[PDB]
Amino acid sequence: MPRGLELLIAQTILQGFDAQYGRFLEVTSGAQQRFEQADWHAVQQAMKNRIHLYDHHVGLVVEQLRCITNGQSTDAEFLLRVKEHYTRLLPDYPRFEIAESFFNSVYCRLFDHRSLTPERLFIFSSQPERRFRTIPRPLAKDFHPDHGWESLLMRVISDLPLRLHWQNKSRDIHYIIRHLTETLGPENLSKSHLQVANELFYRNKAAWLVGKLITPSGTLPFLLPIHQTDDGELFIDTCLTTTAEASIVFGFARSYFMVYAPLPAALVEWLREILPGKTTAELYMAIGCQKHAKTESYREYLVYLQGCNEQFIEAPGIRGMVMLVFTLPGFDRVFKVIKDKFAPQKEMSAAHVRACYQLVKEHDRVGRMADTQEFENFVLEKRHISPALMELLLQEAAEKITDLGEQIVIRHLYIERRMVPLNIWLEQVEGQQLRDAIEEYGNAIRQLAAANIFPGDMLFKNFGVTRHGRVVFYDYDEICYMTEVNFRDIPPPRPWYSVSPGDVFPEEFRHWLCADPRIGPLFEEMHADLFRADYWRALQNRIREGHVEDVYAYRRRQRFSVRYG
Amino acid sequence: GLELLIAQTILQGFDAQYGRFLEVTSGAQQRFEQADWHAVQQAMKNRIHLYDHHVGLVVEQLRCITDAEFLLRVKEHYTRLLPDYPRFEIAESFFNSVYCRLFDHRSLTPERLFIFSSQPERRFRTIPRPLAKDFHPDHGWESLLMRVISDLPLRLHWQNKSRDIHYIIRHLTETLGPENLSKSHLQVANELFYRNKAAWLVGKLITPSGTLPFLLPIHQTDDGELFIDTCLTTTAEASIVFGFARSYFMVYAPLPAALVEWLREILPGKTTAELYMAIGCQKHAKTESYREYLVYLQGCNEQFIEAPGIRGMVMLVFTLPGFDRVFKVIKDKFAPQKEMSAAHVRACYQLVKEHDRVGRMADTQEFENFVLEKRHISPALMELLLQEAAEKITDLGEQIVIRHLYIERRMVPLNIWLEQVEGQQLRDAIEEYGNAIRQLAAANIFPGDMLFKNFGVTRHGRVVFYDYDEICYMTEVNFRDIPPPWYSVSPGDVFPEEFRHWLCADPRIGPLFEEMHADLFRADYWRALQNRIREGHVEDVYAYRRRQRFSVRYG
Ligand SMILES: Nc1ncnc2c1ncn2[C@@H]1O[C@H](COP(=O)(O)OP(=O)(O)O)[C@@H](O)[C@H]1O
Ligand SMILES: Nc1ncnc2c1ncn2[C@@H]1O[C@H](COP(=O)(O)OP(=O)(O)O)[C@@H](O)[C@H]1O
Ligand SMILES: Nc1ncnc2c1ncn2[C@@H]1O[C@H](COP(=O)(O)O)[C@@H](O)[C@H]1O
Ligand SMILES: Nc1ncnc2c1ncn2[C@@H]1O[C@H](COP(=O)(O)O)[C@@H](O)[C@H]1O
Ligand SMILES: [Mn+2]
Ligand SMILES: [Mn+2]
Ligand SMILES: [Mn+2]
Ligand SMILES: [Mn+2]
């Protein structure tokens, strides 16, 4: 059959996705054991492995199509008929939204991400928003405080599958009660109850219980991060009940969660209540469905673009000397394209830059580096581009632009969450907002360093400030691993004094970072360590000794050991 | 008064320089014992840079101390400091380097600096401290080798001393026959030669018929026990271990010239410069190599010519017909295809110079203002020089000056070799070509433009990469599968399937490649290598045929 081939391909693609998501779940399933045996280097390798799964299976499916069709995998009318058959397979399939993403990826491979039209692939979903039926398996369990909250929480902690001893179980329970009472007041507390997700959300050294705390006045997040003693005993480090704290825990600058989710769209829907600020793409990316989040983000971009009456402009701030960065005035994302030629001092390849972006992508981002989404042959309407930006694009990125009459195609760019560059933020805020910004800036350095990321060019212009006031690094092309750096004490005179590649003089940092009397004093007060090579070496040594530094996705004040010790 | 102060400042600088050279070298044992392989790598980078640092310091000292006859008197005072001085040959090199910095490598004459040595050669004298120890088999060879192995200073336990000893006995017996073995002994150098993950015992195997190399490479278990991976007793094998395409050895040598002399008996093919460069005296090797060049030039009766093979589109390459080196100068303008800087090219040569060359990349010696006699230059080459390298040439009447060039050991370009060699020799060449790729890939070097014309074949048949300006790190590359039936490219993209067009177009060669190196056309193979690199693993590299490993030829 000519029609058999069309169906064989459609079933091949869908089979690939069946397997891909099955392997995604199998890797994720192993998060508990990795946590239980504190194999923190297995945890990090698992995040890289799971990140690579989708592209692998897309690749396999494409080579299968290549060998099966013997040429027609490039025929477009053929693959438009495959798409019709594939579309008709989706109404019964549970993960249909991601099945469309997987087909999209296969299509884009076949045609080098060219010729993307709404008829040839699922730029938009082919299925209605008719998915709110009662979930085949409950994804959460209700817990009411019929016998009070002490032995409510003592069942919840009891039902956890974790196979380790608790350091002091009821101590932690009382901590949680203190927080809940101080927050709701005893009367309302006894009226409210929990609905907690049945799967734990794992990240690095933490196992997060994620619930909804439903109260008279409304429903709130309920997050308990579970950590491990150096010995191997479990404790709950805190309790977060604000949407703001939850937004940060599920933040774009953190590694994705490892959470066993056979129906991700259902888990995504359930999370909306406690994450009302997140787009659908952001929620999918928070539970690890990164590639589907890409699909959803291009849709979010299209929605915004068509309803905005603004043009693309260069992003405000200090112009990059390797990246060209533009945005839409009201849009929450930036577009970053690598320049054709970098400043004449700078001897590095565009490929190095791309490699640094991939390094960040599969690293523990530790709440301090933004997630990026790489796009190839991104298409823009000429009419949507500021004349200022269009002139810039053709000066600096000409080799990456091709004309298509009323449109252009950018060969390669990254999409990143938009922030306020810190060099602008520090000119905008005073007193306490300014203190908190410098605290966060220095903490950004420290946490990246302890995670074996040396930021390289640490100037304020290379950090961004989020909606919740957090400082996040985004200039990735001078990153190196901490272990690759040679920290030295005496700064060179500023010829005959020997300095070799990889030499860093933290004492030199104070010249840039304390030049402004509004800022220096504050940096000195809180981050003087950052000017001592011995401090950096200490972090370097702990890293070489295999140690992995704890990271708290919330203020240190909120730790039970702190606010109640 | 200054003239003597200057001579003493320079000589003092060298005293410190070589002292710091030994101290970096001193730490090779501990680095090996604790398998700190990235410490090994950085110590090689550090030690390579030591000399230029100390020259820089001395030059800044001389500058702050603020004629032509003047510096002939500085040189005369310096010369008078040398007759007792033990490492005088390198002291002369160090003076030469200080002079060249002060004078931007201009006006180099035999009177103004030590183009040739000021002292009579001293290989006559008895070494003040023995550098090697004799070992006779009075109680047989089983407990001879257990004496040397026990006497080693290495502080680790052995996987199986007695096995490794038996292994070595098999080799010696199979090589000499039980009779010649009995009237034979070892003279083994007292310092181990450290390189990457190996500690080499280096000896002389003295037989009735003559003297032979005796090399035992000492390796480490993944857990940390010592074993001897083999025993090499041919000069050819020794020449390869000390080859121009391998990293220098780290070997404690208080009298480097004495060690060079001792090394001559084994390794009889190497120039003096090559022996100095094999034990890490890279800058002094440059001095000795310009002397070797001058010697050859005066006795040759031929002119400089463009080097045989495919003309380079970024480098211009010439040589002397009977000479063992090529000169490579960066072109003024590159072919319109290649979008790159002279600075990129210089950077890639610098990458290779301080990289573990892993036996697959040639060492280069950079020269500034290299002076040639016009009468020595072929009219063909002279036209090429002025067409392609005009900005780098200045006229000085009867001579020209090349601003910048690299000198490299000369080989037969592989595209020529493959037209010369057949059957088994041809199989061996393609085996080596693919292994050069593989070994470079595992060392995080992506060769870039891997066509045969960019590799050379050595005197001993080994394939060595020499086109450095398209090198990049494996970790910087994005290996991709080709979309079916053109398609274009994002930064770093490489399509290993495309290799087949170029590398298998010839029916004499392609088939042999598929047989032995089909992996190299599969994106999965390269991606696998990429990951092993990122997951921190460092690939073993054996400076000898895999067959010769004891675990293989005896297990
Ligand atoms: N996530 C972001 N949000 C807002 N602005 C950004 C973001 N990333 C980059 N920019 C802006 O683009 C510029 C260049 O970004 P950067 O990644 O630092 O490129 P380069 O390496 O060329 O300096 C910055 O100075 C800043 O103005
Ligand atoms: N070590 C060498 N031995 C012999 N010939 C060489 C050597 N290095 C370069 N060549 C010759 O010079 C040419 C250009 O060398 P290469 O380094 O590849 O320059 P390019 O980068 O311009 O290709 C080669 O095609 C070959 O003929
Ligand atoms: N240039 C592009 N324009 C719009 N969508 C794209 C583009 N490239 C990839 N995508 C979408 O991103 C998702 C993942 O693609 P890929 O990264 O190719 O696996 C799919 O939904 C694709 O259709
Ligand atoms: N252009 C040159 N011609 C001849 N010899 C040189 C040249 N440049 C450097 N040398 C020699 O190379 C050795 C090291 O020099 P340098 O690279 O300047 O440290 C010294 O013996 C120098 O005399
Ligand atoms: Mn920047
Ligand atoms: Mn940058
Ligand atoms: Mn070449
Ligand atoms: Mn080249």
Listed resolution, Å? 2.5
Q: Does A324 touch chain B (CB under 8 A)?
A: no
Tell me which of B164, B229, B356, B363 is the catalytic residue.
B363
Task: Judge: A63–B481 Cβ closer than 8 Å, yes or no.
Answer: yes
Q: Rounded to an integer, what is the distance from CA B8 to the centroid of its chain?
A: 33
DSSP code of residue B35: T
DSSP code of residue A134: P
Q: Does B488 touch chain A (CB under 8 A)?
A: yes
- What counts of helices (H) and strands (E) characterise chain B? 19, 19
Technique employed here was X-ray
User: What is the rounded distance in angstroms from the CA atom of residue A437 to the CA atom of residue A420?
Assistant: 12
Question: Residues in chain B, how many?
Answer: 555
| Spatial contact of B388 and B332, defined as CB atoms under 8 Å apart | yes
| Spatial contact of A548 and A228, defined as CB atoms under 8 Å apart | no
| A268 φ/ψ angles, rounded to the nearest 5 degrees | -55, -50
Torsion-angle region of A148 (φ positive above 0: left; ψ -120 to 50: alpha; else: beta): left
DSSP code of residue B245: T
| Spatial contact of B95 and B78, defined as CB atoms under 8 Å apart | yes
A407-417 and A453-454 beta bridge pairing:
unpaired
User: What is the rounded distance in angstroms from the CA atom of residue B389 to the CA atom of residue A231?
Assistant: 68
H-helix or E-strand spanning residue A549: none
Q: Does A66 touch chain B (CB under 8 A)?
A: yes
| Amino acid at residue number B409 | R
User: What is the rounded distance in angstroms from the CA atom of residue A261 to the CA atom of residue A274?
Assistant: 18
**CA distance, residue B22 to nearest chain A CA (Å):** 19
**CB-count burial class (<10 Å; 0-12, 13-18, 19+) for A273:** middle
| Spatial contact of B412 and B457, defined as CB atoms under 8 Å apart | yes
Query: How many interface pairs between A and B have CB atoms less than 8 angstroms apart?
Result: 66
A115 alpha carbon – ligand 3 mean position (Å): 11
User: What is the rounded distance in angstroms from the CA atom of residue A421 to the CA atom of residue A423?
Assistant: 6
Q: Which residues contact A234 (CB under 8 A, 6 or more apart)?
A: A162, A164, A165, A166, A167, A226, A227, A228
Number of domains in chain A: 1
* Through-space distance between the first and last CA atoms of chain A, rounded to whole angstroms: 74
DSSP code of residue B66: -
H-helix or E-strand spanning residue B226: strand B226-228
User: What is the rounded distance in angstroms from the CA atom of residue B500 to the CA atom of residue A518?
Assistant: 62
Contacts of B532 in chain A (CB under 8 A): none
B478-479 and B493-494 beta bridge pairing:
parallel
Per-residue DSSP letters for B255-282? SHHHHHHHHHHSSTT--HHHHHHHTT-H
Q: Which atom of ligand 1 is nearest to the CA of A416?
A: 1
* Burial per residue of B339-375, b for 16 or more beta-carbon CB atoms within 10 angstroms, e otherwise: eeebebbbbbbeebbbbbbbbbbbbbbebebbebeee
Q: In testing the pocket of ligand 1, which one of A389, A475, A476, A479 has its CB within 8 Å of the most ligand atoms? A: A475
User: What is the rounded distance in angstroms from the CA atom of residue B530 to the CA atom of residue B526?
Assistant: 6
Closest CA to B407 of B355, B448, B357, B466: B466
CA torsion, ordered A510, A515, A519, A520, to nearest 10 deg: 40
User: What is the rounded distance in angstroms from the CA atom of residue B494 to the CA atom of residue B480?
Assistant: 6
B361 pocket-lining for ligand 2 (C-beta < 6 Å): no
User: What is the rounded distance in angstroms from the CA atom of residue B53 to the CA atom of residue B59?
Assistant: 10
**CA-based nearest residue in chain A for residue B494:** A351
Indicate the residue of B46, B481, B484 with minimum beta-carbon distance to A74.
B484
User: Is B395 in the active site?
Assistant: no
Contacts of B347 in chain A (CB under 8 A): 347
CB-side neighbour CA atoms (13 Å) of A517? 0
User: What is the rounded distance in angstroms from the CA atom of residue A390 to the CA atom of residue B386?
Assistant: 42
H-helix or E-strand spanning residue B59: helix B37-64
Closest CA to B141 of B185, B204, B171: B185
* Helix, coil or strand: residue A401: strand
Task: Judge: A498–B344 Cβ closer than 8 Å, yes or no.
Answer: no
Instruction: Find residue B364's DSSP bridge partners.
Output: B408
Closest CA to B115 of B317, B256, B316, B298: B298
Instruction: Find residue B125's DSSP bridge partners.
Output: none
Tell me which of A371, A436, A489, A534 is the catalytic residue.
A371
Q: Does B448 touch chain A (CB under 8 A)?
A: no
Closest CA to B475 of B538, B532, B518: B532
| Spatial contact of A542 and A450, defined as CB atoms under 8 Å apart | yes
Q: Which residue has the tokens 């989020």?
A: A466
A471-473 and A463-465 beta bridge pairing:
antiparallel
CA distances from B97 to A503, B70, B94, B107, B113 (A): 25, 18, 5, 13, 9
CA torsion, ordered B143, B144, B147, B150, to nearest 10 deg: -70
Per-residue DSSP letters for A308-346? ----BEEPSSSPPSSEEEEE-TT-SEEEEEE-SS--TT-
CA torsion, ordered A551, A373, A64, B528, to nearest 10 deg: -50
* Helix, coil or strand: residue A481: strand
Indicate the residue of A111, A412, A498 with minimum beta-carbon distance to B53.
A498
Range of the domain at A5: 1-565
Closest CA to B27 of B49, B17, B42: B42
Query: Crossing angle of helices A2-29/A40-69, nearest 10°?
Result: 170
Task: Judge: A350–B476 Cβ closer than 8 Å, yes or no.
Answer: no
Indicate the residue of A112, A347, A354 with minimum beta-carbon distance to B491.
A354
**CB-count burial class (<10 Å; 0-12, 13-18, 19+) for B69:** exposed
DSSP code of residue A255: P
Q: Does B424 touch chain A (CB under 8 A)?
A: no
Q: Rounded to an integer, what is the distance from CA A93 to the centroid of its chain?
A: 28
Closest CA to A196 of A114, A277, A138, A132: A138
H-helix or E-strand spanning residue A450: helix A431-450
**CA-based nearest residue in chain A for residue B492:** A351
| A375 φ/ψ angles, rounded to the nearest 5 degrees | -120, 140
* Mutation target among A349, A409, A481, A540 for the B interface, most CBs of B within 10 A: A349
User: What is the rounded distance in angstroms from the CA atom of residue A232 to the CA atom of residue B546?
Assistant: 46
| Amino acid at residue number A351 | A
* Mutation target among A108, A500, A540, A545 for the B interface, most CBs of B within 10 A: A500
| Spatial contact of B416 and B409, defined as CB atoms under 8 Å apart | no
**Three-class HEC string of A38-76:** CCHHHHHHHHHHHHHHHHHHHHHHHHHHHHHHCCHHHCH
| Spatial contact of A253 and A240, defined as CB atoms under 8 Å apart | no
User: What is the rounded distance in angstroms from the CA atom of residue B257 to the CA atom of residue B285?
Assistant: 11
Q: Does B485 touch chain A (CB under 8 A)?
A: yes
Structure tokens at A53: 């799964």
| Spatial contact of A301 and A333, defined as CB atoms under 8 Å apart | yes
Closest CA to A65 of A99, A16, A112: A16
